[PDB]
Amino acid sequence: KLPEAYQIFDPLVDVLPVIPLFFLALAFVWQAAVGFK
Amino acid sequence: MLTLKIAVYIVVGLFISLFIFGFLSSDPTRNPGRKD
């Protein structure tokens, strides 16, 4: 696992990799805020 | 079999060479629109 000093942020490393999915979603959010100009 | 192999190799090489040199022969200009 993560070396011992870092297992306070194990639950953050657990969710970090899916972030680019949220970027792809954020593109559509931004386009929705601009009314899909 | 060896005669067959050589003959097929010649035939295939000629067809591939045709296709390659045709697409090298200024193919983008063979269109009904712009020729730049």
């Binding site: 639950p11 953050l12 657990d14 969710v15 949220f22 970027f23 959010v29 931004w30 805020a33 601009v34 | -």
Partner: protein, 32 residues
């Protein structure tokens, strides 16, 4: 335990961060 709780807190903060950026830009009049 608390691993799903902590995980969901991180996930929710992340989920808000992007839309929060977009909403702030839209409301304060930044370029979009």
């Amino acid at each position: 335990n608390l691993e799903p709780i902590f995980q969901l807190t991180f996930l929710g903060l992340i989920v808000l961060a992007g839309p929060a950026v977009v909403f702030v830009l839209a409301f304060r009049g930044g370029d979009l």
